[PDB]
Ligand binder design. Structure first.
Ligand SMILES: CC(=O)SCCNC(=O)CCNC(=O)[C@H](O)C(C)(C)COP(=O)(O)OP(=O)(O)OC[C@H]1O[C@@H](n2cnc3c(N)ncnc32)[C@H](O)[C@@H]1OP(=O)(O)O
Ligand SMILES: CC(=O)SCCNC(=O)CCNC(=O)[C@H](O)C(C)(C)COP(=O)(O)OP(=O)(O)OC[C@H]1O[C@@H](n2cnc3c(N)ncnc32)[C@H](O)[C@@H]1OP(=O)(O)O
Ligand SMILES: [Cl-]
Ligand SMILES: [Cl-]
Ligand SMILES: [Cl-]
Ligand SMILES: [Cl-]
Ligand SMILES: [Mg+2]
Ligand SMILES: [Mg+2]
Lengths: 180, 180
């Protein structure tokens, strides 16, 4: 149909965290305090020391106000052939190489306007290019909140069945089909 | 010093496996039969179905003779703070997101001429670009042969201490310093 995907503008850009920053992290506020302290206290130093890869959503003005962010880090999970509630009970399992979407926060002022989805689309595309280079099978996410959990589910993230009941996965095969 | 690294020529190129192939896999012969059967029987179909990422060393002639190859696949290993010969004995450990160099074979005619190292350098560079995108901490390799084991060690791959005594690792921090 006359069906389009709309990404980041030049007014509000998504870019990987820079070497020299000049970002206004002091004004950012999403719902959760945890994701707020992380941004101002840990994000820049964890990115520098390559503990994670930080991508920022910012105003592209001289002040450079941060209005959202996300993090990516190589991960792995065991994929059982059937739901195995008791770990390693002769049920087949492969180790699935994935990328974990560790954090995802959007400023309250921007929430519910499609920016969370646009950042997810950005992450999916970063994972997709990397998959074709080194072999990554998807985007993993452990959703704390119920509001966060329904958000990932909506976008087509498969809720995984396991001992922990908050994990979701978006396969690379599915990302392939998004970008054709 | 007047110290240089010399890579693939236009006569002998390293490239990711193509969609349409036209490679002469029938003439390839390294020392090991296993790595020979893999190339002609499994390589092309495992790459297509994205089970791994295959990179080929070929003659760049019309016949397109394959004279070496390698495979990359996202992996993970548990990194203990101290050598832990008995798994999970209250000794600290992080899960290390890595890329596994699954296979590496060079045709007998080309062996001992720097092509194994050049392919390793290629893989390190592919892993390096991917690290900066998604967060990968190094290149993992499980060396079967003693000749294969000494080869990886020579290039600066840290032999890992564990239950399995044939694994080696080349950190991303070290790759950073190679390409500056
Ligand atoms: C850190 C983790 O891994 S878990 C993340 C938890 N983080 C938080 O909860 C922090 C506070 N919350 C936030 O930061 C944000 O609200 C997020 C990250 C949860 C979501 O980002 P937002 O931009 O607010 O959501 P977005 O506007 O993209 O989507 C709103 C909803 O409309 C729907 N929607 C989105 N885009 C469209 C569209 N183009 N057309 C129709 N429907 C749409 C989606 O389904 C989405 O989820 P819902 O249907 O369950 O409501
Ligand atoms: C599949 C796995 O993960 S394990 C791989 C096992 N595969 C096999 O054994 C298959 C058969 N063997 C082969 O395919 C090849 O012999 C390989 C893959 C083992 C090595 O590739 P080659 O191109 O033959 O080795 P290369 O010529 O790069 O290096 C030769 C040696 O000279 C040294 N060397 C390499 N380049 C240089 C250089 N520029 N200057 C000085 N010394 C060098 C290296 O240390 C290397 O190892 P060694 O020192 O232990 O001998
Ligand atoms: Cl399987
Ligand atoms: Cl779930
Ligand atoms: Cl730690
Ligand atoms: Cl070892
Ligand atoms: Mg929004
Ligand atoms: Mg050689």
């Amino acid at each position: 149909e006359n069906l389009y995907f709309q990404g980041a503008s030049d007014d509000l850009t998504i870019e990987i965290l820079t070497d020299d920053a000049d970002y206004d992290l002091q004004r950012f506020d999403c719902g959760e305090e945890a994701l707020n302290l992380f941004l101002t206290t840990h994000l820049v130093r964890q990115h520098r020391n390559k503990i994670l890869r930080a991508y920022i959503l910012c105003r592209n003005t001289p002040e450079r106000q941060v209005l959202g962010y996300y993090t990516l880090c190589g991960s792995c999970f065991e994929r059982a052939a059937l739901p195995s509630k008791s770990k390693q009970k002769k049920i087949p399992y492969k180790n699935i190489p994935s990328v974990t979407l560790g954090r995802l926060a959007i400023d309250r002022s921007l929430q519910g306007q499609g920016w969370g989805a646009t950042l997810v689309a950005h992450a999916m595309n970063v994972v997709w290019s990397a998959s074709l280079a080194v072999g990554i099978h998807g985007l993993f996410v452990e959703a704390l909140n119920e509001k966060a959990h329904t958000f990932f589910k909506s976008l087509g993230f498969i809720p995984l069945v396991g001992e922990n009941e908050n994990a979701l996965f978006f396969p690379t095969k599915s990302i392939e089909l998004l970008f054709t």
